[PDB]
Amino acid sequence: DDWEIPDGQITVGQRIGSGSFGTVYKGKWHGDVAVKMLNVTAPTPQQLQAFKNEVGVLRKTRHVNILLFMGYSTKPQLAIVTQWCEGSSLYHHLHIIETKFEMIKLIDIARQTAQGMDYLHAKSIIHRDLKSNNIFLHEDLTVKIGDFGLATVKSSGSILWMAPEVIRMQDKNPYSFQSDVYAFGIVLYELMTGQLPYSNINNRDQIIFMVGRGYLSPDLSKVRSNCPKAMKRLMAECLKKKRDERPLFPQILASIELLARSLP
Amino acid sequence: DDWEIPDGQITVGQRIGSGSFGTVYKGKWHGDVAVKMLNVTAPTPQQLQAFKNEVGVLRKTRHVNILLFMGYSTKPQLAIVTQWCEGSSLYHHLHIIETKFEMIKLIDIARQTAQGMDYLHAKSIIHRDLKSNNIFLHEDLTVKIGDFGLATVKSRFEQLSGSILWMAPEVIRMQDKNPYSFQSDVYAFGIVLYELMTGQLPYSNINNRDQIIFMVGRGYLSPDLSKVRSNCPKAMKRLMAECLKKKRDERPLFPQILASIELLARSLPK
Ligand SMILES: Oc1c([C@@H](Nc2ccccn2)c2ccco2)cc(Cl)c2cccnc12
Ligand SMILES: Oc1c([C@@H](Nc2ccccn2)c2ccco2)cc(Cl)c2cccnc12
């Protein structure tokens, strides 16, 4: 019952990026895989902690909509190995290559994402950084939620997806299922409008300040016409400035399924 | 945090099928899933064992070409929950609806299956029932090796008698100690490569189950390789023949089979 990969079996290749801790690479281990390593040979103290935290969460997940954790290593360097997703992140599709998804496909992507979130929450896992860039469209179909570590289970910037309470830090622990729900709301906004929120404001600090005070919020009137009213309503629900008024995924999921069933 | 699903969360629907090791369904648990249950009112001691053994093997797997194990339940009834595959099995594509896959695709299905087998064997897991019926073509793109009811971790039964087309001669004779090995899995893989390249099941012109069993076992009968498609790469027809060797110890292991398929793939027509 061990997920530790034997020493020196992982072949590392092209450098991809650098999420959470360390650097991510496309590598080899019983096929293509993603490898999140640590450049230093001296794992330091709190680096060996963020490492054990991620593995600890990742290893509690087995769901088609959650990036597949395959194993970890301490080999020469600490390394988390996950499946290799073929394609691009939803963020890249929507805002870089501006892919034109049909409404059916957009509804389905929101569904799978919620499917995935519902699962994480059932396991008492709070993502804490859900955003269109951590949502991968594997093989152009099938959502894979990724990048954890920053994720916890039970007791740069990504402000666009941060709920008002999170921005305020009036608890130092404003994170909860509800704040995950809010970010999903911002993700819904992207799919449904094809754009990032507040694109007409060029000052981040202003954006941060105003969302936190409840003065600014996503402009829902921007939703595409062919967007089902029930979706636009689900969206507003998730984006409630007041935490406790937001619905939970079991509910989100039911709503998205009923609007999807009656769409064609 | 075990993989034991909390009680009363799994719902079951369509009865996709039956079997000696339980019947399959298309239930739900955080999205669609495949639920394998046990109809009986009280599991016999051997069933409880088959259940445990499968879960023990399944929970050791995390690979894109292995059907995803999600959890099990015992309280309501013994149940194994796996991801629900969208599409059909390679068997159905190949022999029931005759799907016209391109050689590039066939080589690909052959590669992924090998990739999966390579993964199981590295963890000392012997499938023991690899066949096109248990190879799901998820979304018509991803190969998912399933049905782990007879699987076992080396150094850890008397079942099966239905799918003889994929049984190696030494498995039919049951002479040797440990009839099953990484090699018998490789033989089954060989019959699958055979199915992929010919589009047909072996021994289609013989209709007597017993005679086929006896003959393949005695070595009088073997897969007719002259039937392999003409556009089938030579190295492949060779790799196939090697996996089908009558002498167990002459068959290559998946790491080498994997290396070969990947090699003959890089030099394929354009
Ligand atoms: O492609 C991958 C990325 C990249 N995400 C996206 C998202 C949209 C389009 C293109 N890439 C990325 C890397 C670094 C920073 O972002 C990140 C990780 Cl962890 C992967 C893990 C396994 C397979 N593929 C992965
Ligand atoms: O569909 C599934 C089957 C059935 N196989 C096929 C093959 C071709 C077309 C349709 N179904 C089946 C039924 C009975 C005994 O095996 C078996 C498993 Cl393990 C599955 C696991 C996840 C998703 N789907 C699965």
Q: How many CB pairs under 8 A join A and B?
A: 50
Which residues of chain A make contact with B70, given a CB cutoff of 8 A?
A: 62-63
Q: How far is the CA of B146 from the centre of ligand 2 (A)?
A: 9
C-beta separation of A183 from A158 below 8 A:
no
The domain tally of chain A equals: 2
CA dist A144 and A155 (Å) reads: 25
* Cα distance between residue B133 and residue B124, in whole Å: 23
Contact between B250 and B113 under an 8 Å Cβ cutoff? The reply is: no
Domain boundary among A58, A86, A114: A86
Residues near A62 by beta carbon (within 8 Å), at least 6 away in sequence: B3, B62, B68, B69, B70, B71
The two three-digit tokens of residue A54, written as one number? 């991620």
User: Which residue's structure tokens are 């999205």?
Assistant: B31
Cα A237 to middle of ligand 2, angstroms: 39
Q: Are A78 and A36 in contact (CB under 8 A)?
A: no
Kindly state if the Cβ of A85 falls inside 6 Å of ligand 1: yes
User: Does B3 sit within 8 Å of A62, measured CB to CB?
Assistant: yes
CA distance A156 to chain B (A): 32
Q: Which residue stretches of B18-148 are H helix?
A: 45-58, 90-91, 103-122
| Same-domain check for residues B114 and B242 | yes
3-state secondary structure chain A: CCCECCCCCCEEEEEEECCCCCEEEEEECCCEEEEEECCCCCCCCCHHHHHHHHHHHHCCCCCCCECCEEEEECCCCCEEEEECCCEEEHHHHHHCCCCCCCHHHHHHHHHHHHHHHHHHHHCCEECCCCCCCCEEEECCCCEEECCCCCCEECCCCCHHHCCHHHHHCCCCCCCCHHHHHHHHHHHHHHHHHCCCCCCCCCCHHHHHHHHHHCCCCCCHHHCCCCCCHHHHHHHHHHCCCCHHHCCCHHHHHHHHHHHHHCCC
- Does A22 count as an annotated binding residue? yes
Separation of alpha carbons A218 and A196, rounded Å: 9
Contact A174, A165 (CB under 8 A): yes
Q: Which residues pair with A81 in a beta bridge?
A: A35, A71
CA atoms in the 13 A half-sphere facing the CB of B165: 21
* Domain carrying residue B28: 1-86
B137 strand-pairing partners: B88, B143
Pair A226, A257 in one domain: yes
Angle of CA points B94, B96, B99, to nearest 5°: 45
- Residues B77, B95: one domain? no
Chain B: nearest CA to A55, how far in angstroms? 13
- Report d(CA B129, CA A151) in Å as an integer: 39
Tokens of B253: 């292991």
- The reply to whether A256 and A159 lie within a common domain is yes
Residue closest via CA to ligand 1's atom 20 equals A34
A189 and A101 part of one domain: yes
Q: Could you give the residue numbers annotated as active site of A? A: 129
What is the spatial distance between Cα B137 and Cα A212, in angstroms, rounded to a whole number?
48
Q: In chain B, which residue's Cα lies nearest the Cα of A120?
A: B30
- The answer to whether B261 and B110 are in contact (CB under 8 A) is yes
Which residues are bridge partners to A6 per DSSP? Answer: none
Tell whether A17 is in a known binding site.
yes
- Let me know: does A154 contact A103? Beta carbons within 8 Å: no
| Cα distance between residue B94 and residue B143, in whole Å | 14
Q: Alpha-carbon Rg of chain B, whole angstroms?
A: 19
Q: Are residues A253 and A226 in the same domain?
A: yes
Same domain, A106 and A26: no
Q: From chain A, pick out residues whose CB is under 8 angstroms from the CB of B119.
A: 30-31
- Resolution of the structure in the document, Å: 2.5
Q: Which of A41, A71, A86 is the last residue of a domain?
A: A86
| Cα B129 to averaged position of ligand 2 atoms, centre (Å) | 15
- The ligand minimizing its distance to the Cα of A24 is 1
Q: Where among A38, A69, A86 does a domain terminate?
A: A86
Among A261, A214, A221, which residue's Cα sits nearest to residue A242?
A214
Length of chain A: 264
Residue B203 backbone zone (phi > 0: left; psi -120 to 50: alpha; other: beta): left
Tell me how close the Cα of B156 comes to any Cα of chain A, in angstroms. 14
Residue whose tokens read 């000696």: B20
Tokens found for residue B248 = 């167990």
Shortest-distance atom of ligand 1 to CA A91: 8
| CB atoms closer than 10 angstroms to residue A232 | 17
Query: Are A82 and A96 members of one domain?
Result: no
- Quick one: B101 and B124 in the same domain? yes
Assigned token pair, B255: 């790491």
Residue of B nearest to A61 (CA): B70
d(CA B261, CA B108): 9
Pocket test for ligand 2, best of B14, B15, B21, B24 (most atoms within 8 A of CB): B24
Tell whether residue A255 is among the known ligand binding residues. Answer: no
Phi, psi of B112 (to 5 degrees): -65, -45
Experimental method: X-ray
Q: Are residues B82 and B93 in the same domain?
A: no
Q: Whose CA is nearest to atom 7 of ligand 1?
A: A89
**Phi and psi for B71 in degrees, rounded to 5?**
170, 180
Closest CA to B79 of B157, B27, B30: B27
Shared-domain flag, residues A255 and A128: yes
Which tokens belong to A121?
């929450």
CATH value at residue A40: 3.30.200.20
Q: Residue A158 belongs to a domain with what CATH number?
A: 1.10.510.10
Among the atoms of ligand 1, which is closest to the Cα of residue A36?
19
Protein residue closest via CA to atom 7 of ligand 2: B89
Residues B45 and B164 in one domain: no
